[PDB]
Amino acid sequence: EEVVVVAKFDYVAQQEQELDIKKNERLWLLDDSKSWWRVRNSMNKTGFVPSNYVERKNS
Amino acid sequence: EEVVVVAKFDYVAQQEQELDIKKNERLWLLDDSKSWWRVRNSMNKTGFVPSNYVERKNS
């Protein structure tokens, strides 16, 4: 459910909602069942949603 | 690449960084190649990082 993850690479956060990490840092993964996509709505609000809640429009 | 996605299901945001969405709403997916995990560091700062930059310490 919550588990510890290890950074494989550095990451410089590009927004306030992101986290800067360093290679080999250990971090809590809050929910190991959740992968998130960053989306933007018709009102120009941006945020994260669980990736399985959306799908590409091709029909 | 940016693409249009469609909500499969409603989602009520649990945190300010997430977005509320309604089934059938159309959204911009800012980067179709990018999935994120929410993590918490040793200083108890939380944020999103690309999922492929981190791996489980155990299994």
Residue numbers in the entry:
A (entry chain A), B (entry chain B): 4 to 62
Task: Please share text taken word for word from the publication where this structure appeared.
Nck proteins are composed of three N-terminal SH3 domains and a single C-terminal SH2 domain (reviewed in Ref. 3). Nck recruitment is required for complete T cell activation, and its inhibition dampens TCR signaling by reducing Zap70 phosphorylation. During our studies, it became clear that Nck-SH3.1 exhibits conformational diversity and can swap half the number of its residues to form a dimer.
During the crystallization efforts that led to the monomeric apo- and peptide-bound Nck1-SH3.1 crystal structures, seven more structures were determined that all exhibited domain swaps, leading to dimers. The swaps are located at the exact same position in all structures (i.e. Lys-36 in the n-Src loop), clearly visible based on the high-resolution electron density. Dimers are formed by exchange of the C-terminal 25 residues, almost half of the entire SH3 domain. The C-terminal half of the SH3.1-binding sequence would get into steric conflict with the second SH3.1 domain in the dimer. All of the dimers are swapped in the same manner, but with different juxtapositions of the second SH3.1 domain with respect to the first. Indeed, the hinge region varies over ∼6 Å within the superposed ensemble, and the distal loop covers a distance of ∼8 Å in the dimers. Given the large number of swapped, independent chains present in different crystal forms and grown under different conditions, swapping seems an intrinsic property of this SH3 domain.
